Structure formats: structure tokens, C-alpha cells
Amino acid sequence: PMPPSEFLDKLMGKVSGYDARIRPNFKGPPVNVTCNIFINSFGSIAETTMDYRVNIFLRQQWNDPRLAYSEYPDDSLDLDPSMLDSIWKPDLFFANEKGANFHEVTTDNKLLRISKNGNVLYSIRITLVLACPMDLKNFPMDVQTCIMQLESFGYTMNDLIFEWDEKGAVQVADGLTLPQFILKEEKDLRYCTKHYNTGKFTCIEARFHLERQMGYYLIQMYIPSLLIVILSWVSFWINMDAAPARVGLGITTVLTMTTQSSGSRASLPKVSYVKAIDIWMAVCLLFVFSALLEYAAVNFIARQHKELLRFKTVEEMRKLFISRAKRIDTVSRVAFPLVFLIFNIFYWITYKIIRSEDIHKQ
Amino acid sequence: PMPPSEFLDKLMGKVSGYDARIRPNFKGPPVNVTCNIFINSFGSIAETTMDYRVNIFLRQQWNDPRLAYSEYPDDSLDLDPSMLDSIWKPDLFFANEKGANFHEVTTDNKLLRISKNGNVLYSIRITLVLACPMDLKNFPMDVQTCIMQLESFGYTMNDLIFEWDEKGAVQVADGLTLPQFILKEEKDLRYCTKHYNTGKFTCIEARFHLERQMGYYLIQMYIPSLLIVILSWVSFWINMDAAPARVGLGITTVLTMTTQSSGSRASLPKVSYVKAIDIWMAVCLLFVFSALLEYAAVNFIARQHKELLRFKTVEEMRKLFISRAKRIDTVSRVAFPLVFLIFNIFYWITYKIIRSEDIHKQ
Amino acid sequence: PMPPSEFLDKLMGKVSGYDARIRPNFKGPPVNVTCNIFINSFGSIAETTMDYRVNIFLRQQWNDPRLAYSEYPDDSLDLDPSMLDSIWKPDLFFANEKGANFHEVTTDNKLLRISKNGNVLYSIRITLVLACPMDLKNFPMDVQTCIMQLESFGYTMNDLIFEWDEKGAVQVADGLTLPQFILKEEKDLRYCTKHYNTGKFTCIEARFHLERQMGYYLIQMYIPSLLIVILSWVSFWINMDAAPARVGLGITTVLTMTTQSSGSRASLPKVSYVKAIDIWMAVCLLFVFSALLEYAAVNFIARQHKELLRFKTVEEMRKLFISRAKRIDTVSRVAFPLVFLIFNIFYWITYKIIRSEDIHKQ
Amino acid sequence: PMPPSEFLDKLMGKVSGYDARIRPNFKGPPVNVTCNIFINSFGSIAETTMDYRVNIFLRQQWNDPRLAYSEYPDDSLDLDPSMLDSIWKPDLFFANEKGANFHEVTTDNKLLRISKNGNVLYSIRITLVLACPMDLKNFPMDVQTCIMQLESFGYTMNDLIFEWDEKGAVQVADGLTLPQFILKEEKDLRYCTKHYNTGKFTCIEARFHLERQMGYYLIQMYIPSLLIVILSWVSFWINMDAAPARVGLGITTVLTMTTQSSGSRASLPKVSYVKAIDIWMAVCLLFVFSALLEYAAVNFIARQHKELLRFKTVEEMRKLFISRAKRIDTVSRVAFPLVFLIFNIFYWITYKIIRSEDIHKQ
Amino acid sequence: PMPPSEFLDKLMGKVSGYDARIRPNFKGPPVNVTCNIFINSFGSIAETTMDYRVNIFLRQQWNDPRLAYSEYPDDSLDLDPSMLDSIWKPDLFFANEKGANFHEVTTDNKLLRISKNGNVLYSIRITLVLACPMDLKNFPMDVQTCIMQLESFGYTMNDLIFEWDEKGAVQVADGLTLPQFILKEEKDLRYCTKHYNTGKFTCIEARFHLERQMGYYLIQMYIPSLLIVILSWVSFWINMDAAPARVGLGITTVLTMTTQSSGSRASLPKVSYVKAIDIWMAVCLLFVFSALLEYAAVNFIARQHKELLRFKTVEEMRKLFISRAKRIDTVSRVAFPLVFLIFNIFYWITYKIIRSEDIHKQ
């Protein structure tokens, strides 16, 4: 029978001794805050500035003794979010972030629900440009581990304690997909406490293990390099007397291998360690460069042939240099793709075992 | 005869028991909100970040019993938008969005119209960077379906219910055109209700079917690839003894095919499935590569010819290798464009039937 | 003798019955608002997102009967812009716009001047990213018509009427120049009234006719294409037996024509109609491709010559094929630039007459 | 002995008749405002959108008679910047600007100092994206004159007059350097008064003469063009019978000259007048194109030689065509670099005299 | 026993004489402020606009006598950051900065802790786009010294004095790494006082010495240039009669050296001094150009050979020109890589000693 306006100005009134600046149960045990997040959107992962953009529904549960009411019989009592000025919302800030803008569209995207015993549910929707450091030791295949840290500002560990939720940890939205990565099902909850000269502060963090998909990099980078190496193999069947043809074919394959290697590393930060694509493009470039060196040795042997022919064992030395120049081409035509196939299976199995070692060590 | 200032401070006065924080007909049936949007601008569709930018006139109709007035005889009573602080505007937020900024130019772009029985018309102009996931299984021709979701924050399904309008659904502005797409005439209205641990929330969505126009991609991508394949066909008429000419022509056609294929995929996200342009550029690249292989086989047969000529059935084996080297060119000159025409009609009709299957399944 | 503070709190005081929420002469004829704009900056015209950025001094003149004062003898009475909260500024918003931010530097850039009879002068400085659709049927030469629409939000045609000024229409700043376009001297004032389900709203618009300057596109695009076609003509004087030279020259001219055509269309939206540069680059590419086809026919005739010479009317058939192979080069050397000159004068005069037809039809 | 709180609420109190909306010495002579700016940062000069970014310390000095105090004996009395709401700051706005955001970091970056007789010192730190039109008649060497205009909004010339400072004009920070330009020591102070239909408004402007440094453009653009022309000269020493070598060398030098000319104009607005780099790249391209034409004439004369040799004064006509084909190469080998050196010294001295004429006319 | 609300409204109440506009110990000695910063994130260093982005925890310690309390026995008394409106926070602003936005996510990221004797701890989290000028005299290896200046606005040296902290200077976060640079362990604390016409202002600065990592530039820039020079060395073994082969190989190596040199300088400001990569690419380009000149001299000597052979000491002059043309190739094949190795060791040791001289002079 009681009207709701006096009831919802009674608990936050200045005739009441609420004092929203003062934390609950002052001069006592620390407040325990339970947090669960809901990943609404995850994406826009950029490697060159090492950050990613999430959309989260940050839900914070804490108990306030002064907010308890015994008049109304309903337990939930969902409230309007405009009177969220004097409730004592806890301070929370993300340790590694940029941006972090609120959503003010059509209303402030906020949820306030005060239970009968004093439990408060506080939900806010925020997009954060979270910055995570990434390791690029293996660029085509890798398991990145993005770190999201939630800690407090201005309340030490003896006054405010942040804890993860027990029923579930992180709720991902159904149907959420990433175009370049695959989000793993398990998520780590390791809370570490940062120490500062001012004091220690409560901090909880969650880790997402991101598997990079290998379907795009196989089409864009691995197959055109094989096309270039196969073309340099095609140069072996051409006639050895046709010098501009073989020289031009080999030179253009080396040039396009260099430009392809320079263009695949363009969308990457300037890291100072050797990656896997470096190894792949280096061995492919070495293969086309060795093909050009093989033709240069063949044409040098033919040069020695032509100088000793035109100005005495001349016939059998002509035979020896033509037979040797034919033997080099005949053994190269078999030896080049076989050693390339050996390198391919060795590289692929060692990266398969180091990828499985990364997924086993985690 | 009554002056308007007391009348428009009477209904929102604190001597009145309006209480704009409290929802209308509290502790009763849920409020029913009818929404229709007016697409003022639609465009700026970017594939690489998978989002689009709309300009909408969001109109929300709901009934308030406390707002009803019986003194004035006029039914419409358009009001000034500055007193839109205490009216109980409903909470609405878009589920998949970025940005969503209001228009504050020369006034707040808002409309408030309170009917005599209590019906409230609330119109706001907002630009939203709506994020939609897109499928790129067929890149030149495709029918994208952009999804716009409108749901509530902080009021469950038992308290707030969102419904679409019956007289029309989505009003598009007259004369509105898209440079890259064609907006279909019908629009789906399927409302789905999202479930969360806190509770269930009302949500309505509208789907726009966007037909990608095929006029630009025919000029930019399909015809230069045909030019490259026709040039590789031109290489068959050149003399077989002119080895640097045919080798250089074929090598530059393969190189420019590779760079054209790498440059057409630049304005696209790094997806991990095979698209239609992948198939097209792959078959065209295979055609120019097979032309280079055909010349390599011709010059290998001529090599065998020259070695057996210069160091016995020599005349008729010279005839056999010259006749075979002529026969390969003569059959290739006919066989290459005919099999290319066969591939063209097969690819085009299978993509026509899969495009019509996409437009029939919807 | 009267001090100014009471006089300027008398007309906007709450002891006065001003009521700035209520429009002037309520329940009567509509308010007539006269608007003239002053183009302070115009520029930053981008084709790929189809919008332009103006800086305008929006001046709005309307009459308020309650604001009239008879105490002071001065007629102008320029006022301070801080008390522009309760004056009843009219609602105005641009129909096709993005951005539209106010200038808050060192003060709010505003002007308020209330005349003695009640005339109010309201000037504000705003930069608007106005979005205009453009037609690219002729890309090098074209006359774009940018549309600026000013309409009201929340006041129908019976309550608010917008009208253009009679003394002048749009004042452009002296010395204002555009690097890529030429602003015409006349400007259209056609007011059209938009109709919506809620009601009809007053709207006035102004059109600027922008002539695209042809000096840059002649240097960047038209002359290098002529350089490529002249180089392909140079290929006719080279010896026909030198096959790698003529083949390589023609192939590199075709390749660079393709890359030049692909690079000139890069700073343009993905439109689906044929433009004028498409026609120009297509005919130039056809010319260099026909030159390569002419050399392929010459070397095919020489191939027939060489096969019938080396394995009977042999001398006179050698004469016939050498004379025909010389005659093809001799007639091509004259016929190629003459038909190119004919195409040039036809293309140029038809685009001159369609440009003058566009400027005559307007 | 007087406490400071009553003294600093006495002069701005509503029990005082200060009335900060009303300008000082109302209904009298115009207020005289003295302005000096301090260039803290100058840079980020972009040619393609024709604007530059400054950081200025805007100091405004004006006298207020009502602010005068005779109680305290100190003359300076530096005040706190939070009570800068009611002081009657003068209206000032920059005529050609974008952005112009204030600095709100750790405090509002403001200075307020009220002298004993009524002199007010008002300093604010602002970064402005000032837009200046630039002339690109000579692109490598040029003296740009950036214009910064400071005028008033809403107060005419009879009420507000802006004047420059007498002790110094513009203070540049010590150690301030520009990477691409050199700031001259003198600065022009020409005040021009803008006239509008509403009235005339006071305006003062300052001009900075910016000398473009020529060290970068000599390395990036002038020397690689000389490398290309020297390579085309190297083509003269190669054997005339080696036709693919000389043809390929000349064709690749023409192609790379075209791409170098197209790439140096990329970071520039689309202006419609001929610049100096246009002239330089045009003459260098003409030189490499004439070298290709010279080889085409040599090989045409050799063609006439070969046709009259193989199907009578044959020996002496063979002599005449070989001697003439040798004489063309021998005279070209001397004549090409000498005429290039003549063009170089003529171009360089005429641009030196037109640069000195620009610096003498100013 | 005293409740906290009256105690925390007593010290900031208007019944108290706090007067937060007035600085502490007015008309006396200057306030001494001790500042220590905590580098939370450091990165996003861009060379082309010469600025870097930090995340700092700015801690300011100063003593206020009026804030002292003797009632409560606790010494720390951490307070809520909402009542940081009237505390007299000191004015602080960074001298060389852009941006500098506060963090408003979930709360204002602020810390307020008032000690018992009057010591105030004020911590704020800010991201600043700090602009630092950089010297690019040696581009691959260099030690940049970023300067962060903290000074006051509106309080002179006699009223406000800024001092660095004694216990530590700058705290870097543990685990913080930079992808392109290495942050040195020591940091300079040199405070310089800026002088202005208005007065002198306190300023303290901190310098970070940044070592540029050399691992990326060795892979991206130094090794492909060696590949190009090694390929030009490979051109010496090819047959001298094969003129199109050697000419084409040398010409394409010169062309790709030019494009590689133009592409490595793309991500750099337009500086006007010679860098180290300029010297490296210039010597490598000189090496490939000299190889092309060596082949041109060889083919000129062979031209003289062919003209004196075909139209008398003819046999021994044929011997002299063939022996000399062989001797040039034989001495070049040894002399080119040896002088390249000499240049490599000289360049590397002189840059090692100038890098160590830069790290010794600091």
C-alpha cells in the first residue's frame, strides 16, 4: 500500500544517514565484490599496435548493509538507472586499456538491482581497446593469450577485495565468431595483486587463448612462393645456349620472390626476432638463387668450352665439357624438387610439433 | 483561456505526483512500445571491418496514464524538446553497434508529442555504426543481410515489451541510393528475445537484404584477367626459335597475373575460406602457367632435335621432331581458347544458379 | 538613465511571463524565419565518401512580440551571447550532414541582437560535413551540384515556416578559392517541403554548381597515356628479325598501360557505370594491344616464309612474303597515328559538346 | 589584515554591481585589447589539406574600471583560474581554423592576473589547426606565408577594438625547430578589418614567412632522375647490332622515369598549374625518350643498309650508311650530356633568380 | 565514536574557512610539491610525426596546513575521489604534449589521501601524446632521448615550486617491453626553469634514453641490398658475347636497388641531413652501377675488336683486344667483392665507434 516515491527517496535521502561517499561497513572488514563479464563483441584485433577491442557487460555484485529494506515483500526490485549518483559504486579500472567509453545512446546503458538483504547488482556496457602484448615467434600458426586485468584505484587490499564469480567465469555470446582467430573454450582465472609504493591493490584477471586460423595464410603466402619455386624449376628444361631466356627467367623469379617477401611482412610490427615466414621466404629465395647460380656455372663451363674450341685433345675435351654441362642439368632437374620436398616435410612437421608443444604447455 | 505555462508545469511539477523515475502503471502489466524507424541515410559500407553507417529517425510510441489531460480540447499538442528530462523515456540500446552519437546542432534533434489520452511520440535522430557479420563465400555476387537489433537494458520482459509497428515497418527515404549495393524492397521483421543470467529482455530486429552490384567488378577485375590470358594466347603465334621472346612474354604474363590477383584481394578481410575471385584468378593463372609449360615442352623437343642433329635415320627423326613440334603448337592454338570458353560458361552458369539459389532460399 | 542589469533581467525574468519554451504568438499564424548563410570556408571535397566540408555563418531572423521594448531609444542593442538559454531559438537541422560541431574557442561563437520592434538576429558559426551524392558519368570534366538542405525538427508547417532572404542569397567570402574546383557565381534557391507520417516540415535548400578543373587531369592522366601509345608506335621502326626487341617493347607497353589504368581509378568510389577515363584508357590499351597483334601477324608471315624456304616457285613466293611483310609495316606506320588522331578529335569534341550540354541544361 | 575570501567575493559578488554580461565602460568609447601570442609548438604542416598546427599562449590585455581595488597594497595579485566565469572575458575567434581545443589536463590551462588600476591579463593555451592557402608555383624551393587571423564575434568596431602589442609582436620559443621548413626572423603585423552586412568587426593578423628547406628534395628527387639520365647515356656505348640490349635499356629507363615522376607528385594537392618538378621531370623524360628515338633512327639506317645489301654502287653505299650510323652515335655521345649540362645551369640559375625575386618582393 | 560524515564535511564546509581558491599558507613561502610518476604503458612511438604515447600515474605530494586534523587517531585516512572539487589541487601541465585525456571509466581514476599533519597524496592516471624532437643522424642505430616536461600555469616561482622525489625518480612497471626500442635503466632528472615576460615558472623534466634495436633493420634492409650486390657480381661470370643477358641483369639490379632505397625511406620524416641508410644504399647502388659500367667498357672494347676485324697487324691486335677484354673480367671478378668487403668493415666499425661515442657522451 505504500507509494514508491517516498520509499525510493527514503533510502537515498539526506534525512537518512546513507552518506554515499563513505564505503559500506566502514572501519571493518573489506568489501567483497564478485565480478562476471559477458563478452558481447570481440574482434578488431590488430597486430601492428598490439591491441584488441571488446564489448563487455560488466556485472559487479557487492553487499551494502545500509541499503537493506524490510517494508516491501518483493525480493528483486529492479530500479531506474538515473539515481546511480549516490549508491557507492565501487571503483574499478582496467590496467591495460585505451578508450573505454560508456554508451549514452537513448539512455545510459546501466542496470541497478538492489535485493532485500542488501545485495546490489550493477551492470554497465563498455567497449575497451584492451592492449595486450603478443609473441610473434611463429607467425602463421600461433596461440595468442590476451590478458584482461581489472583492478581498483584508491582503495587498498584491506578495504576492497575483488573476486571472480563461482558460477561460471566469462560468458561469451552465442553465435560470436572471429574472422581471423578461434576462441578457445576454457579461460584462465588467475588473480594477481599489484604492489605499489602507496599500497597493494586488489586485481583479478582473465586470459583468452586465441588460436590463429591457418586457412588464409596458406592461400595468400605459401602457395605463391611455391609457384615461384616451381617456375624456377621450369627454367632447367630450357636450352642452355638460349642465355637471355634462362637468365631473364631466373632473375625475374628472384625479384618477385624478394617483393613477395617484402610485402607479406608489411602488416606486422617491427619485431626483432626471426619468425616462421622469415624462414620460409628465406629458404624459397635461397632455392631460386641457387637455380640462378646453377645456370651461371653451366654457362661458365660452356664458356671454357667455347674458348678452348676457337682461338690437341680437342674432341675429347669438347666431349668432357658438353657431357659435364649436360650432367649438371640432368642431376639438377631431379635434385632440386626432391630436396625441396625434404625441406617442406621437415619444416611442416617441426612446426606441427612446436605448435602442439605450445598447445600442451599452454 | 488557460495560459500554457501553468499547464505545462502542472503535469511535470513536483506538486504533481508524476515521479519520472517510476515507470507507468507500476506493479502491473508491461508497457508496450511500438517502434518504427526511418532510414535517412544508409551507406559507408566497409568490408574490412564488417560494419555500416545508418542515419535513422527512431520513433517510439508508448502510453502513459499519468500524462493524460482533459482541460485542453486539442488532440496533438506538439511540445518543446527541452523538457524531456522527466517524461520517462524508455531505455533502448542497439545490440551490435559502435559510435551512436546524438545530433546537437542548433538544438537537440528531438520530437515530443503527447496525445490527449496519454499516447507519447518520441523521435530522435541518431547515426549508428552498426556492425554486421558478412559471409564472403561468393565475393563478386552476393546478397548480404544486415541485422539491426533494438533491445532494452535494465527492464525485463515482464516490465517492458518492444513491438514493431503494424502500419509499415521501415520507411526508407525517397531518392536514397547506394553506390555499391542495391537495397531490396522487402524487409524482415523477426523479433527474438535474448536470455541472460539476470533475466530475459525484449528485443526486436530488422533485416535489410543488400544485393551487391556486379558492374564495377566486371570492369576492374574480370576483363584485365581476360586481357592477360589473351596475351598468353598471342604467345603461340611467335616463332619457336625465338626463345627469349616467347619466354619473356610468358614470364611477364605470369608475373602480372600474380600481382593482379594479389591486388584485388587487398580491400578485403583476412577470411579463411575460398571465394569466387580466388577460383577465377586461380584458373586464369593456371592457364598462363600452362602456356609457359607448353613452350617449355616445345623447346625441349627442339633441344632433342638439335642434339641428335649435331654431335642413322637422321632425316626422318628430324622430320618427326619438327612435325611433332609443329603439331603441338597447332593443336594448342585451337585447344587453349576453346577450353577457356568452356570454363567460362561453366563458371558463369554455376554462379548464376548459386546466386539464384541464394535469392530463392533467402 | 536606467541601468542595464535590471533591463536585461526584466525581459527574461521569471517575474515576466516570457516562457521561452512557448513559441511566439502561440495559437496563431506560423513564425516566419529568414535565413542567409555566409560561406567562410569551402573545401575538403572527397569523392570516395561523397561529402564536403563547409564553414558557414548561419544567420536566422525572426520576430518575437514579447521581446519588444519601448524604454531605451537605441535600435540595435547588441547583447552578450551567454544569455541565449531562454530566447526561443528556432530548431534547425541540416538534412544531409555528418559532424556539425559548434565552435567553443575562447567563447561560444554566437551573435544575439534584438531590435526595438522585436526582430531577433541569431548568428552561429558551424562546420558541417555535408554529404552530397555525385554523378560520375564524365570523370575528368563534370559539373557537380552540391545540395545543402535546412529543415526543422518538431515543428510542422503550420507552426514554423522557413524562407530564404530577399537581399542576396548566399554570401561567399572574398578571396575564397578551391584547388580542384571552380565555384559558379549563381546559386539556386529551390525550397521543397518534406512530408513524413508525423506531418509536413518546412525546408529550404541551396545548390552550388561546382565546375571540376581540367588542368590536373590533363597532366597526370592524359599525357602519360599518349607517351605509352607513342612508344608503341616507335616499335614499328625496329627490325622485324629482332623478335625479342619488338615483343618485349610491346609487352611492356601493354603492362604499363594496364597499371596506369588501374592506378588512375584508385581514388574513386566503386561506381557501376562507364566513365570517360574508362573509355580513354580502354582505347589507348586497345591501340597498344593492336600494335602487339600486328607484330604477331608479321612474325607469323615470316614463319611461313622460313618454313617454305628451308625443309618450286620458291623465289617469287619469298618475294611475295617479304613484300607483304614489308607492306604491313609500311601501311601500319602511317595508319596507326592517323586513326589515333581521328579518335582524339572525335572524343574531345563529343565531350566538349556533352560538357556544354550539361552547362546549358544545368 | 583583511582576509582574502571576502575581498575576492566582494568584486564578483551579486551584492556588487559588477554584471559580467555588460561590457566595461558601457555606452562609451570602445574597449582596447592588446594581444601578444607565444608560439610554443609549430609544425605538422601538411600540403595536401593545406593546414598547419600551432600551440599558442594567447595573452589578452584590457582595462576594466569596475575591477579596480584600492584596499590591498600589492600591484600584481595573481588569481586562481576557477573564477573566470564572471570577469567579462572578450570574445575572440580565429577566422581560418579547425579544431581549436582547450587543454583540460590536471587543471584548465588558464592565467588570470588583475592589476590594481584595472588592467587584466588573460592567458590561455590552445592548439589550432590553422588553415592557410599555399601557392605551389615552385615546389622544391618556395617561401610560404602562413596567415593567422584573430577577430571578434558579436561586438562591432565601435564597441571592441583589437590591437597588437608594441613591445614585441610574436614570441617564438627558444630551441623551436621545424624539420621541413625554416621560420624567418621577421613577422608582419598587418591588421585588416572585415566588413559584413551585420557590421564591421575588428581583426588583427600575423604572417609567418616559411622557407622550405631544399636538402631533402635534392636527395630524394633530383639525384635519382640524374641517375636515370646517366644510364640512358650509357646506352650509347653498347653495340648497335645488339638490338634487344639497347632497346630494353632505353625502354626500362623511360618506364622508371615515368613511375618516378608519378611517385614524386603523390604527396601533393591536385593543383592545376605547372610546378617546377613538372618541368624537371618533363625535361629528364624528354632526354631519355630522345635517346630511344636516336637508337630507333640508327637501327632504321641499318635496316636500309641490310635491305640494300641482301635482296650497283653497293660498296660505297654500305660505307655511307655505316659511316653515317657511326657518326650519329659519335656525335650523340658528346651532344647529349653537354645539352643536359646547359639545361641544368639554365634551370638552376632561373630558379635561383626567381627564388631571390620572391624573397626580395616578399 | 565520531561519525564520519560531519568530519568530512567539517574540513571542506563553508562554515569552515577553507577557501579552496586560496593557496595554502597565503602571503608566505612558496608551496613545495614533490612529484613521482609511474610509467604504466610506454609505446606507440612514431617517427614521422615525432611523438610517443605514455600512460603515467602522476603522484603529487604537497602540504596543506588548514587540512590538518587532530580528532581521529588514524594516520592515512584514504578518501573518496568525488570530493576533489575543493581541495586546492595544484596546477600542472605538460609543456610538450597533445591529447592528455583523463580516464572516466567506471569512476574517475583518482586517488586522494590526506595525512594527519596535512600531507596530501594526489594520484591521477593520464595518457599523454608527448611530442619529442628526435635526431636522425644515424638511422639504423641511435639513442633517442625523449623529454617529458612538467610545469605550472598561473603560479610563479615565488608562489609554487616543483621538485622531484628523493626516494626513486620514475617507476617503470615490471614486465614492460617495447617492440622497437630498449629503455635504459638510468633516467636523468634535470630541472630547468622557463622564463616568460609574465614571469618565471617552476618546471621539472625527466629524460628517457631509448636504444633503437638493430635486429629488424638488419633483416629488412641490409640483407636484401647484399642480395642485389651479389647478383650483380653474378653477372661477371656470364658470357661477354651474350649482350642482352648481361645488360638486362645489370639494368634490373640497378632498378630494384633504386626502388628498395626509395621504399626504405618511406616511413620517415622529410629530414634534410644525410642518414646512415642513405650512405649504405648509395654505396650499394654505386656498386651495381659500376658493374654495369664495367660491362659497357667490355662491350666497347669488343666493338673496337669487331670493327677492326670486319670492314695489317690484325691477328695480334685481335689478341690484344680479346686478352684485354678477358683481363678486365678476370680482375673485376676478384676486385669487386674485396673492395665491397673493405667498405663493409670500414662502415661497420665507424658506426660502431660513433654509436659507442654517442653512448659515452650521452
Ligand SMILES: CC[C@H](C)[C@H]1O[C@]2(CC[C@@H]1C)C[C@@H]1C[C@@H](C/C=C(\C)[C@@H](O[C@H]3C[C@H](OC)[C@@H](O[C@H]4C[C@H](OC)[C@@H](O)[C@H](C)O4)[C@H](C)O3)[C@@H](C)/C=C\C=C3\CO[C@@H]4[C@H](O)C(C)=C[C@@H](C(=O)O1)[C@]34O)O2
Ligand atoms: C573484351 C575483353 C578483351 C580482353 C578486350 O579488352 C580490351 C581491348 C581488346 C581486348 C580484346 C580490354 C579492355 C577494354 C576493351 C575495349 C572494350 C570497350 C571499350 C568497353 O568494354 C565494353 C564491354 C563491357 O562488357 C564486358 C560493357 O560493359 C557494360 C556492362 C554493364 O551492362 C551489362 C553496364 O555497366 C554498362 C552498359 O557497361 C561495355 C559496353 O563496355 C570498355 C568500357 C571496358 C572497360 C575498360 C576498363 C577501363 O579500366 C579497366 C582496367 O583498369 C584495365 C586495367 C584497362 C581496361 C581494359 O581492360 O580494357 C578496363 O578493363 O579492350
Ligand SMILES: CC[C@H](C)[C@H]1O[C@]2(CC[C@@H]1C)C[C@@H]1C[C@@H](C/C=C(\C)[C@@H](O[C@H]3C[C@H](OC)[C@@H](O[C@H]4C[C@H](OC)[C@@H](O)[C@H](C)O4)[C@H](C)O3)[C@@H](C)/C=C\C=C3\CO[C@@H]4[C@H](O)C(C)=C[C@@H](C(=O)O1)[C@]34O)O2
Ligand atoms: C606532348 C605529349 C608527348 C607524349 C610528349 O610527352 C613528353 C615528352 C615528349 C613527348 C612527345 C611527355 C610529357 C611532357 C613532354 C614535354 C612537354 C612540356 C615540358 C610540358 O607540356 C606542355 C604541354 C601542356 O599541354 C598539353 C601545357 O599545359 C598547359 C595546360 C593549361 O593550359 C591550357 C595550363 O594548366 C598550363 C598553361 O599548362 C604546358 C605548356 O606544358 C610539360 C609541363 C607537361 C607535363 C609533364 C608531366 C609531369 O608529370 C607527369 C606525369 O607524372 C608523367 C609520368 C611524366 C610527364 C610527362 O608525361 O612528360 C608528366 O606528364 O615530354
Ligand SMILES: CC[C@H](C)[C@H]1O[C@]2(CC[C@@H]1C)C[C@@H]1C[C@@H](C/C=C(\C)[C@@H](O[C@H]3C[C@H](OC)[C@@H](O[C@H]4C[C@H](OC)[C@@H](O)[C@H](C)O4)[C@H](C)O3)[C@@H](C)/C=C\C=C3\CO[C@@H]4[C@H](O)C(C)=C[C@@H](C(=O)O1)[C@]34O)O2
Ligand atoms: C647472407 C646474405 C646473402 C645475400 C644471402 O641472402 C639469402 C640467400 C643466400 C644469400 C647468399 C638472402 C636472405 C636470407 C639468406 C638465408 C640465411 C638464413 C635463412 C637467415 O639468415 C641468418 C643470418 C642472420 O644474420 C645476418 C641471423 O640473424 C640473427 C640476427 C640476430 O642475432 C645477432 C638475432 O635477431 C637472430 C638470432 O637472428 C640469422 C641466424 O639468420 C634468414 C633468417 C635471414 C632473414 C631473411 C629475410 C626474410 O625477409 C627478408 C626480406 O623480406 C627479403 C626480401 C628476403 C630475405 C632474404 O633476404 O634472404 C629476408 O632478408 O639467403
